[PDB]
Amino acid sequence: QNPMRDLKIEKLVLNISVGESGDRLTRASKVLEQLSGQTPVQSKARYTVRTFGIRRNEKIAVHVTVRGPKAEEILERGLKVKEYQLRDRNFSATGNFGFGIDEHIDLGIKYDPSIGIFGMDFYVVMNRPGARVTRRKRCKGTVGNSHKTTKEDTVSWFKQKYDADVLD
Amino acid sequence: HLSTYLKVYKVGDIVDIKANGSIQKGMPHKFYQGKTGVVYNVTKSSVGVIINKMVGNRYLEKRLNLRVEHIKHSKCRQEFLERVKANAAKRAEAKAVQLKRQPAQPRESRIVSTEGNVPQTLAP
């Protein structure tokens, strides 16, 4: 029985990790900006590595978060690229799931060699009503075991809506 | 420990010094620890305390200021005041004694019975 113990989507984070910093980052900027409607966030490097070719504080990625109907709409238009076929993995233990796409032009947006091509990673966090207890300030607490999301519940919800497969 | 702040300290009261590690401010006096002194003046933030410190073979008088967090009320005079009040009551009853203290006296005569307690003899 599930009157309020459903499994709604909470949010989707779309991320673009670039090998270099500059107008390439600004272009990936622009891509996620146009896809979401809102302004994205530029993420810097934590530490220098010198084999990936970067340094501390270099602005080496850009990402964005989306909540609401927009999130699942973009999710479906992206999963069309993966044609509704994920793996047994790509589902976390705690009940979240994500994938990655090359050739972002495979959802609506055209080639436009003005800018080039980028790939991006979708990650999608799931929950139920009542997550506010671990997110508010006053009254903070944690959620019970029975109400915890899980890989099995998410995979069943996914073999349900979007009507997909597991592929191994 | 908030009960270490709702603690009135009037001039005259006696207090022990026991500074806790949890407050870096005003950690006083390395060997003024477990030592007792009465309070002479009080300000905000503050209490006065005087101690008789001995140097050579005379007791000189060191006055000091301390945060309230380190000081503590002394239970030094509890039995003294209890005995004084009981002495007033006993003096009133006499007016209507050995109110003084006395060490442990030799226990007096008595009788020990054998009803169900027969003595149990034994050996090494």
Partner: protein, 243 residues
């Protein structure tokens, strides 16, 4: 594990629940203490869903004491059934508790506001209750900064705007806009208001209503308390477990 549990140091119970902040509490309760007894009084405002709380507390090693306490459920008696948690309603509750305490002290004193955990934001209902109390006449220290309509771009304030907020102007203009733009959300969010058919001038007059009423009798007409103690106790013990 065993070692981690043993080396664990638990905080205070009231902190383990997200209920108090001893950092702020000590700065509040701690006195000058050159002056000895001089009990320090603090007005405690709290917001739950469906209800507001305003109290005036002294604290002592007994743990604390409540000389005066009011809530928003009293305001139906004073002329408003609706919107108990809003800005104007908390303002009314603050004026109520202020006139109450001033009556009991017989003067018409100095009380320090407790914010709790709520964030300090321009246009907050805690500052609405502050203005209600200062209305009532208790001298609390404050600044005109955080009242609404404070133009963040400079150091000035418009009194007419927070006057409208006291009278319930934002809810009224939103009522008007949502009404002349739609009726789905209107019928959903204003069912009692819809059955009552109240006006903007209306609702301002009702708040004036209630203001004069609390100025008339702030003496805490208490609840009627049906089904006295033993009834409640036995019926609750029917459903209380026991070892």
């Amino acid at each position: 594990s065993s070692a981690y549990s043993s080396r664990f140091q638990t905080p205070f119970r009231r902190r383990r629940e997200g209920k108090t902040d001893y950092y702020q509490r000590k700065r509040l309760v701690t006195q000058h203490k050159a002056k000895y007894n001089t009990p320090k009084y603090r007005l405690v405002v709290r917001f739950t869903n469906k209800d507001i709380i305003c109290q005036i507390i002294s604290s002592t090693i007994t743990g604390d004491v409540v000389l005066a306490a009011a809530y928003s459920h009293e305001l139906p008696r004073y002329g408003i059934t609706h919107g108990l948690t809003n800005w104007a309603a908390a303002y009314a509750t603050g004026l109520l508790i202020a006139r109450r305490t001033l009556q009991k002290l017989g003067l018409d004193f100095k009380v320090f506001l407790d914010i709790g955990l709520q964030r300090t934001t321009t246009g907050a209902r805690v500052f609405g209750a502050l203005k209600g109390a200062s209305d009532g006449g208790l001298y609390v220290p404050h600044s005109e900064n955080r009242f609404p309509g404070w133009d963040f771009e400079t150091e000035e304030i418009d009194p007419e705007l927070l006057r409208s907020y006291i009278f319930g102007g934002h809810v009224s203009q939103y009522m008007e806009e949502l009404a002349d733009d739609d009726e789905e959300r209107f019928s959903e969010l204003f069912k009692g208001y819809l059955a009552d058919d109240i006006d903007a001038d209306s609702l301002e007059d009702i708040y004036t209503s209630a203001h004069e009423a609390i100025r008339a009798d702030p003496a805490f007409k208490p609840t009627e308390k049906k089904f006295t103690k033993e009834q409640y106790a036995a019926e609750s013990k029917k459903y209380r477990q026991t070892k």
